[PDB]
Amino acid sequence: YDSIFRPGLFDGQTIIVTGGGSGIGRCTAHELAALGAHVVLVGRKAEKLEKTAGEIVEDGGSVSWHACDIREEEAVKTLVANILAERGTIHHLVNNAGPSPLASISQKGFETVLRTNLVGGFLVAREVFNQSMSKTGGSIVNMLADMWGGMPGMGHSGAARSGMENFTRTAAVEWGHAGVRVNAVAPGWIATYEGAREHVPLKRIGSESEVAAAIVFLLSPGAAFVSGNTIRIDGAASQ
Amino acid sequence: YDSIFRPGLFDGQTIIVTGGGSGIGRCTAHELAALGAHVVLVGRKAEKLEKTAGEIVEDGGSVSWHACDIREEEAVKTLVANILAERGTIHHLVNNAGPSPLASISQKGFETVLRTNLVGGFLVAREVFNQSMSKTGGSIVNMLADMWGGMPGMGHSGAARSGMENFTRTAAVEWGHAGVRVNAVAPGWIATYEGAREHVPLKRIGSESEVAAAIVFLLSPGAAFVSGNTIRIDGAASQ
Amino acid sequence: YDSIFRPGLFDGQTIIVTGGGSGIGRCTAHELAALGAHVVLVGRKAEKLEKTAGEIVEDGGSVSWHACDIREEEAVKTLVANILAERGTIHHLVNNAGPSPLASISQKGFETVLRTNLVGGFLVAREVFNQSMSKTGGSIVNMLADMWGGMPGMGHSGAARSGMENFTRTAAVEWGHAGVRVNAVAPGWIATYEGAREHVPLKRIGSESEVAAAIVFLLSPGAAFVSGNTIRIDGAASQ
Amino acid sequence: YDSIFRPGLFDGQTIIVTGGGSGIGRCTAHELAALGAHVVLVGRKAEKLEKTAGEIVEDGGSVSWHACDIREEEAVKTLVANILAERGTIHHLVNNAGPSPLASISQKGFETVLRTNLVGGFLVAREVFNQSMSKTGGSIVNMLADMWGGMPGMGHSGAARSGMENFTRTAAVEWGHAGVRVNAVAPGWIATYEGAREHVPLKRIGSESEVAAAIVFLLSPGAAFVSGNTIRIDGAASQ
DSSP states (O other): OOOSBOTTTTTTOEEEEETTTSHHHHHHHHHHHHTTOEEEEEESOHHHHHHHHHHHHHTTOEEEEEEOOTTSHHHHHHHHHHHHHHHSOOOEEEEOOOOBOGGGOOHHHHHHHHIIIIIHHHHHHHHHIIIIIHHHOEEEEEEOOSOBTBOTTBHHHHHHHHHHHHHHHHHHHHHGGGTEEEEEEEEOSBOOOOOOOOOSTTOSOBOHHHHHHHHHHHHSGGGTTOOSOEEEESTTTTO | OOOSBOTTTTTTOEEEEETTTSHHHHHHHHHHHHTTOEEEEEESOHHHHHHHHHHHHHTTOEEEEEEOOTTSHHHHHHHHHHHHHHHSOOOEEEEOOOOBOGGGOOHHHHHHHHIIIIIHHHHHHHHHIIIIIHHHOEEEEEEOOSOBTBOTTBHHHHHHHHHHHHHHHHHHHHHGGGTEEEEEEEEOSBOOOOOOOOOSTTOSOBOHHHHHHHHHHHHSGGGTTOOSOEEEESTTTTO | OOOSBOTTTTTTOEEEEETTTSHHHHHHHHHHHHTTOEEEEEESOHHHHHHHHHHHHHTTOEEEEEEOOTTSHHHHHHHHHHHHHHHSOOOEEEEOOOOBOGGGOOHHHHHHHHIIIIIHHHHHHHHHIIIIIHHHOEEEEEEOOSOBTBOTTBHHHHHHHHHHHHHHHHHHHHHGGGTEEEEEEEEOSBOOOOOOOOOSTTOSOBOHHHHHHHHHHHHSGGGTTOOSOEEEESTTTTO | OOOSBOTTTTTTOEEEEETTTSHHHHHHHHHHHHTTOEEEEEESOHHHHHHHHHHHHHTTOEEEEEEOOTTSHHHHHHHHHHHHHHHSOOOEEEEOOOOBOGGGOOHHHHHHHHIIIIIHHHHHHHHHIIIIIHHHOEEEEEEOOSOBTBOTTBHHHHHHHHHHHHHHHHHHHHHGGGTEEEEEEEEOSBOOOOOOOOOSTTOSOBOHHHHHHHHHHHHSGGGTTOOSOEEEESTTTTO
């Protein structure tokens, strides 16, 4: 990985990446493993966790994976316990896991998205805090989205990610005493930096690497006084 | 009611007030009925809907009430249908219906609050739009809360009301073509205007009347170009 | 004036309206005078202050006017003194007074707009507070603009009005102990409520009356616990 | 400098750092020079530009300095011209340059702070864009402050930095077509990462290094799709 960060920046650290088997989660896992982290991939599909862990191992990285539906509280409790039994500590967590007009969204559709894009990340963060981070300090990055003026055509995802942005701030306040930082990233339209439509002022679509580098920055010692903060990665499309 | 608004401002209009049997909902219902509206009180408890409808009738107002759990989609669909069969049109909707450290909030606790403080209001607004307002225009006001920097000690309510603030914006955008305005109010600490702790710059607690007047303003013709907007009623405590 | 507010709502009150001789200032002055206020029009041009005061007098209202460049501190100090000598108290203040790519804005152009759209309103508010409102309580409404995601094509006005929005919050905090509320209105594109382009979700341009009613609401007893708050009047165009 | 970024990340690049002779500007200049940048220090005092350039040269870095009052437009025009004659290109710009109750702030006091904390940075950015960056692309980082809910006790600085935050967004939109990113950092209370009061949830004061790393991140290829974005560095104190 052609990272902007110095080699070995995350040597020896255990970092959970939910949704780690695909997309931005997979890109971020790869960059963190290239920087020396032991990445713990979490996701619903064991098959793409396996394949992405396969890539990371071939590329010389250190990785483990767990198949888990993080939308279920008992599963998350056991997941975090199983990770701690294997690793001893969790240094960081990346909550990466997660279209219709409002008039067409059903109660079940709205609630499924809340569980996927808000409740799941809340449960992983709560258990990571309760079981480990409340004792050690650490940092958490939540995946959001460009919902700042609402999210037309995706109102249920906007409400969920707005909820997750609020949780980010609340947790930054409530958990700061334990040395725990909680931040977020809000990518815009993601497919010219590649370490791995025209209503964008920069006039291009972003890359997975362009989201991962912001996530990695927020986990790094350089972000040690950054908490409660969302980095938008949208080419200024939200402005 | 000693309202700041002119008599008869809402003559002949049907206005749904969820959570209408108590607190801010009851205060707002009273002011709207004093201004000539036919207020339709909706709530889980028939007993306090009955008693508040009793007060409004004695005070010379026009009112109906329906006991309904608005957290259930089929019930809401029938509720709105039953209101339209009785009234013909719904001119406005007030979504008024709705403590623990984050570490202690369970999945069921978090999800119950999302359903109460986000999903319920979404369902009433969606059905009011789908069954009537999409054809006539109208306005909707959602109850929020002071969650702007998160809501420590009430993280689940903050995430829910942040979600409801996002829905307010999304619905203002998606439904504006139908002549539908969607706005919100975010009260701070509510118990010197009474038409019916010291970290507040105004150095007092707010009143129910001080929230109702903002809700009524947003339903009025004076707010005809106000949409997607949240009025904070918190004595500047959020600043 | 066909106001949504009850007759006599501002009986006996002295209200300063800067920029009161034209546009939104003139509309707001007319509505406040129709509600019984003694409106004090302030502006650079005596001729349009005279003509608007003429209209208000013919329409049966109470009004005085002062020609003053509020961008000059000594003039403002004497202005407020002269108003207090005539009226005894100032109950409310409406700061209403106030295109180029950024690359073309000169230092003098940028600074002229800061003085017009930020410094002037700061000086009037400061003197109104220092000379009277700090002793009596009262409320202030500042005119802003739709600058929430910046103000492309009008970057100097956006920076000025963002500065004025910040002042609104700071003053709400610093002056709340004196019973002084400080709020703002941010109109969007202003030319269906008329008490006196298609990237708008409501699909129309706003009216002067649709801004004035929000200003009047913020001065009213109904807004007694509203401070530090900006009402956007933009048809949801900012969302 | 013990930077989190890989050696040579800014090899061969010319980066202007206003206010570069002291504080956060000096810390950021040192980190960028340690990463291979040619840092151009700009400030009012030649003596502390000289001394900080002395440190950077001793530490093995590449640096030039110009004494300039950036609050004056003609001086800035010549400054940028002189830098381009020496360097050929400007790859990045760090606008780092920049207490009283509102009631006590005079027109001259308010205006001096606007010129220092808003106009100066606008002029440097405008000329850097007009003379060079509009042709090459590049990125700009503006120093702000924690003014999100106003800035009590520092109302003039809050209005100025809110104005500068607005300019950041406007410039990100207007200049994005040229490949120019414009971002900001908003430090909170700055004096546990040191690469070079108790109302903070993290329960400590931040360091200069903890601001510089965020600035450096925003200039880096990792931030290539980040524009119009402010990183708060305040230990979650603003939440």
